[PDB]
C-alpha cells in the first residue's frame, strides 16, 4: 500500500496538481502520525520491559498522544 | 610447442619488469569528482549526461 495510495484513501474519505500535492502532504502527515503512535507504543513497551509491543502499549500511546495534542 | 619456444625466447630477451602516493591520491580525487557529478547531474535533470573523465 503506497503512500500515494494512502493519499488515495484520504481522497476517498475526503471527496489538479495543487490538490494532488495537498493530498500527498496529508498522506505524509497521516503516515507520520501513525509512526508516532507506534513509536510511543514502543516507548511504553520499554517501561514494561517484556518481549513485544502488546496492545495496551499502543493504547497508552494513543492516550498520551491525545493528552499532548 | 613452437609457439612456447618462441615466447620463452622473446620473454627472456625482454627488459625486466619495474612511490605512487601522490598518484593514488589524485585517483581518489578523480573518483570523487566524477562520481559526485555523475550523481548530481542526474538529479539536476541535466540535458546531456556524459562520461565525466
Amino acid at each position: 500500500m503506497d503512500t500515494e495510495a494512502l493519499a488515495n484513501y484520504l481522497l476517498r474519505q475526503l471527496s489538479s496538481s495543487q490538490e494532488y500535492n495537498k493530498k500527498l502532504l496529508l498522506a505524509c502527515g497521516f503516515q507520520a502520525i501513525l509512526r508516532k503512535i507506534l513509536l510511543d507504543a514502543r516507548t511504553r513497551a520499554t517501561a514494561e520491559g517484556l518481549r513485544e509491543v502488546y496492545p495496551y502499549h499502543i493504547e497508552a500511546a494513543t492516550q498520551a498522544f491525545l493528552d499532548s495534542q | 610447442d613452437e609457439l612456447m619456444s618462441k615466447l620463452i625466447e622473446l620473454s627472456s630477451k625482454f627488459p625486466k619488469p619495474t612511490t605512487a602516493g601522490k598518484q593514488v591520491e589524485v585517483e581518489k580525487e578523480n573518483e570523487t569528482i566524477q562520481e559526485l557529478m555523475i550523481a548530481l547531474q542526474i538529479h539536476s535533470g541535466y540535458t546531456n549526461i556524459s562520461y565525466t573523465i
Binding site: - | 589524485v26 585517483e27 570523487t32 569528482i33 550523481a39 548530481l40 547531474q41 542526474i42 538529479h43 573523465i53
Partner: protein, 111 residues
C-alpha cells in the same frame, strides 16, 4: 610479442590529465547549469556559484563542516536536492541541533 620487442625502445600522465579534466568540468557544470537553474540569489549566479564552489570543494573532501546553517538560504535548496539524490549520508546529527553535519559517502573508501 615481437611488437613488444620494438616497444622496448620506448603512463602516469593520464592520471593528472583526468584529474585536471574532472576539476575543470566540475567548475563548468556548476557555473553553467545548476545555479542558473535554481535562479536564486537575485540571479547573481556568480556569487551563488562561488558559494557553491566552496560547498563543492568541501563535499568532495567529505568535510563534516558542511552544516545546514553554513548552507545559506540560497543553498539550502541545494542541500534539499542532495537529499533527493540520497548520495549524502543523511546524518541525523545528535551532537548539535540546527547545525546538522551532512556529507557524501566517501567514494574512496573500499571495505
Amino acid at each position: 610479442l615481437q611488437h613488444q620487442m620494438t616497444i622496448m625502445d620506448s603512463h602516469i600522465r593520464t592520471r593528472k590529465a583526468r584529474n585536471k579534466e574532472l576539476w575543470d568540468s566540475l567548475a563548468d557544470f556548476l557555473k553553467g547549469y545548476l545555479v542558473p537553474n535554481l535562479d536564486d540569489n537575485d540571479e547573481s549566479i556568480d556569487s551563488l556559484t562561488n558559494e557553491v564552489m566552496l560547498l563543492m570543494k568541501r563535499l568532495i573532501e567529505h568535510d563534516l563542516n558542511l552544516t545546514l546553517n553554513d548552507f545559506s538560504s540560497k543553498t539550502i535548496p541545494i542541500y534539499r536536492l542532495l537529499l533527493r539524490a540520497n548520495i549524502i549520508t543523511v546524518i541525523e546529527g545528535s551532537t548539535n541541533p540546527g547545525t546538522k553535519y551532512i556529507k557524501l559517502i566517501d567514494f574512496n573508501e573500499t571495505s
